Amino acid sequence: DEEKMELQEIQLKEAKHIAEEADRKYEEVARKLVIIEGDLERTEERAEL
Amino acid sequence: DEEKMEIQEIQLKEAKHIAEDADRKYEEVARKLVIIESDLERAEERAEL
Numbered sequence: 001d002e003e004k005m006e007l008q009e010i011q012l013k014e015a016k017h018i019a020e021e022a023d024r025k026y027e028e029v030a031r032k033l034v035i036i037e038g039d040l041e042r043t044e045e046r047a048e049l
Numbered sequence: 050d051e052e053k054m055e056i057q058e059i060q061l062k063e064a065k066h067i068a069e070d071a072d073r074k075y076e077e078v079a080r081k082l083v084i085i086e087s088d089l090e091r092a093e094e095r096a097e098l
Contacts, residue, residue: 001050001054002050003094004054005050005053005054005057005066008057008061010056011061012057012060012061012064014054014069015061015065016064016065018068019064019067019068019071020069022071022072022075023071024093025075026071026074026075026078029075029078029079029082032077032082033078033081033082033085036085036086036089037083037085040085040088040089041091043089043092043093043096044092046096047092047095047096
């Protein structure tokens, strides 16, 4: 049981490591998307004017 | 030790599931951004005309 517990803890640490990049990429994509949306809004308003 | 086994097992499985859900939420926004960018380019051309 002790050896199985150690290896399971190592696997859990690896999965917890992977989830961080998996989230922070989505963070960056949202940060890009909001700027793109703002640019679209102001361009449309300029054309209407 | 067996109690610690089942605790860490359910912890690891929940972490894997939430990572998969984060990956799907990543997957949608790419094509969302692509179509928004295409609309931005079209609006810019209209403004230039």
